[PDB]
């Protein structure tokens, strides 16, 4: 009609504005100084092998209470866990043991419930007589504390549906009885609530709520009709054992969390012992480019210590940003009050955020992970397991295995910012992989966005913000000017940026990275 | 010499979208300009709210039409129909009808189908330029059959217009108007200087219009088109 | 009609424009920096006699979970194919004894359904009163986990013909139920589903689904009904014994993976100790122009290992390519945590594949799969065989065999690069075969793209691109200097292109390939 | 002025009188005319 | 005024006014907008 504004204008009378160009603007967002922590462990609450997230205020209720040491082996991660969220927020994946089963309650036409427990990762199959059943997918076994649910009758929507009000209370051991969620659902499959939204009951459970799911029988939904049932009782539920796990759970975990569709730079290994599961997070570091800070049993001496490394299975040339640690000292646990022996790994994590932190427009990735500024262990009444025996700094320097020590004040700190990576030049320092990783992130990104183009854009937009970048690298000091300014010039980095066929833009930069002060020498002199 | 963008059954799985390219019957050295899509994904119809499946060829005029709307002199002809800034599909609870399977990504860019990717913010997109042509040279690419065709239809007009005129007049003509028209798309940007400057000159096109009988004016123009950006690879290195 | 173009112009009034030449820019697409592996075993899943496909994210579940050690010899392939994923995807061919079997579900008229079970590789013949059945192709004897296949009816479809639902869920041992797979298929020849698609039950079946197929009988399809089965069950599958293998499965699986319609790089010799094998295996070197990684019995004593070497065949001068190598040592496995031996084939490709992955243009094939930053070895408490014994590295030199060694800070690593050319020039070392067989799998497809033109075009095309690849090599730096440039010129490549008569294109390249730095020697002086 | 004053001069009009025989005046003016404005595109940018 | 007053000048705003054919009056105007401020960062420091 008319007011109406045309973009071609071709061979006709008339007036036409192009659309807005926007192309010599282009940024790109990655936010570099933004570090998260992914992992695996065993818990007490938890949907099973399925990406949580933790932050500072809701670990607590979202992976369970924590566990008690004298119950095994289990009580490692959610110490890790707390240990590493001090800084940020993370992912998680809790694996279980194979007989782990939840609780599940089938009704029927009549409304009589009834109760089972089926393993985890398991679908339901329904009755000829079961109208639909109710399980519980928080993970929890239902067992401290108790979980009830209650029906009660509501008045019918607009149409006619009939929907009922479904109220979950959890009971304690001690008599607190606390209402948990409430939802009004009916079993038409378009009846709606008070507010509008679906009240269909398997498709809201899914929706609106984290604790509940449900199924239904097809055949029987029709002539289907709920009663009033008051102070129902889930029950089966049961975590099983979780002192030993096969390795084939790890597996199935570690590669959901490969699978998941989240970012994350560091791959900690969460008070997991087992070779191959290391392995495992030692690929996902490599694949992503990424860092890990992985740990031995600390329970071993410093003559057999050296060994595990190797065995452990990193001990290469693909794995060069993840670190091996070892802590074979005892502590005062925070809760329970006893004498618990557990890793190094958020610890270390904890050091590489105050490190990443430091710098605010790009982050500073050139910070070492150890010292007595940012690598502080707090304990309690820390006892050494050995006090016999003797570090070999030699040999752990050369296997490639950080050590712990006394710094000035007497606190703990680490001491070493070694990585896995067997070749004697650059790349076993901690700092220079990190760098060079976040650098090849957010080359990545770049690239990505910029796909696809003509040279002509393509050849300035790379350079423009290839340049920007490593000049806001610069200006944060992670370069410095090269050692030998005689045969390698005297700039931090060098850029190009070339075409090796039709399409084949190919981006070559070098940087020197900064020199980390691990060995100080001082020679007094005196003068005639 | 126009450009066609048709699309072969998206209900057929990975295994057999091959084949049933070999079959529509354009992989020849006669159709430089068809492209051929696949797009195996249901979607949520915006009228009656169901699960149905349909193609893309729609969506990749969408995309070249974008591109040839960019420049606003000779139009934007240059401009490959992918990307993540031109080449978006908009749907509704896109839903993978084989979650199962995989692509093939060399056998597909062998057998030249055009495949559909995630970008990034996690919208589909378009990530392929290939044409019907079998040859491995410049034409198999998209951008550079329709830049030809441009110059060649401006051309057979240009043509039209000045035949049976004396040649006094024709040969000023001819090179007056091809001239300007090579200029013009030099300065819009989609030619470039040819890749080795010691052999070809230095320019980006190259014009000679000649006479080879009584009535025979023959015009011969050669152009450097421009490198689209497919391929992005990065070498860190570290400096002593 | 109008606005139509003419290409011909002959005699007559008009304008035409020549289709466009594109001739003298005519490129060749190879990607020589690409690698693949193909090898040949036995395992637990996957279809029979057939080449498949393993990535690093799918093996586990289309080759089935590993085997047991304790079970026999069977455990090998599976460590192998582990090894030697770490690095890029391949393909794989298992080859069953005679006596396995799969299982077959026979409907009849009235529905009710048969079992029965088949050995592989042999079709099916239907009785009287059979209307269909339907069998299982994944290759799993259907014994751990049980499948359970269940057919619901379902609505016709517009025309009138009845489409029935297929479920097929597996069921574990501990009594998990998860769903497989699902459709909707009908007998009828032309029925379709509602998506559109055909759903004809032996086509839909072999089309869209991986995991079963079906046959019909044509007399008894007409009337053939199918009531409502739930929960059937597969039975008498079995994998046979696969501790012995007769030298017929090995030959046919090696021919299988000859007549493959795929591109790989090498021919890896997966935990296969037959000399008819090896042998095979050799000869698809010789015929594609790739590599082999083979390897003797890892349990011979370091005095029979090197007639053994001459027993599995390949000495001589047609496999200049396959390298043959011998691990006697034990070391602790990652799953089932036992003490157990294998080869070092799926680490040797590993090697190699590191070596391919340096140069990013053309990839680096210079780089011999030895040393210490390139060949490392990771295993798990390695604890040697024989200690007692000691190697005979002058006998090893001369016999062709592949020694490992102790290189710095403790890790076992590869400490040669001989192949099995007896004869002493250039041709037996690892890194020169390679990088001649890349050079000349770029000239084949040149030149079968080139096939068939006149000489002018022909001549300019070859000589611009073999030109053009030598000059990357020699930026890429696998070709120098000449060692005399006295007699046979400067220059690293040389390159002629002749006429031999009407049809006869000859090319000849010669170049001089890099020295490998294998012996060093120091000789320290005194100056007066 | 003319479009482009590189060739045809500089001048709007040129103007030439000749005699060709002993009476054929012939007087030849080349002029170049205004250009109308019947299509206007306007194209923004950004800056950065 | 643009951010990088070193290539892009350091004007506000470019303009151009052309003549492409007889009559094709193109129009080209460049603009450096406001930069709203949605992200707000404060680094204390301690001099010695």
Known sequence: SQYSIQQSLGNASGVAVSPINADATLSTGVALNSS?????????????????????????????????????????????????????????????????????????????????????????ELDSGEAFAIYVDDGDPCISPTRELTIETATADSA?????????????????????????????????????????????????????????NEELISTAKVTNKKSLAFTGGTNGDQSKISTAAYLRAVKVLNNAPYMYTAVLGLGCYDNAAITALGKICADRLIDGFFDVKPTLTYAEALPAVEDTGLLGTDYVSCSVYHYPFSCKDKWTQSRVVFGLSGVAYAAKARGVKKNSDVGGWHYSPAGEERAVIARASIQPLYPEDTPDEEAMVKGRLNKVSVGTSGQMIIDDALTCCTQDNYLHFQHVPSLMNAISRFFVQLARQMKHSPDGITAAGLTKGMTKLLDRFVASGALVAPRDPDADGTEPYVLKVTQAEFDKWEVVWACCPTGVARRIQGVPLLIK
Chains 1, 3 share one sequence.
Request: hydrophobic share 40%; with cysteine; proline share 6%.
């Open 160 to 216: 006619g549906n009939e929907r009922f009000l479904l109220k979950l209370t959890q009971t304690t051991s001690l008599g607190v009885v606390t209402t948990l969620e409430t939802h009004t659902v009916s079993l038409a499959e378009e009846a709606k609530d008070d507010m509008g939204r679906l009240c269909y009951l398997p498709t809201a459970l899914e929706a609106r709520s984290k604790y509940l799911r449900a199924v239904v």
């Open 36 to 124: 998260l922590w992914a992992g695996i462990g065993v818990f007490a609450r938890g949907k099973p092998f399925t990406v949580l997230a933790v932050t500072e205020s809701n670990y607590e209720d979202v992976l369970g209470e924590p566990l008690k040491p004298s119950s095994g082996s289990q009580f490692e991660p959610i110490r890790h866990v707390y240990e590493a969220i001090q800084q940020t927020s993370g992912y998680v994946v809790r694996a279980v043991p194979d007989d782990a089963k939840f609780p599940i309650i089938m009704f029927d036409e009549s409304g009589e419930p009834a109760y089972s427990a089926l393993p985890y990762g398991s679908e339901i």
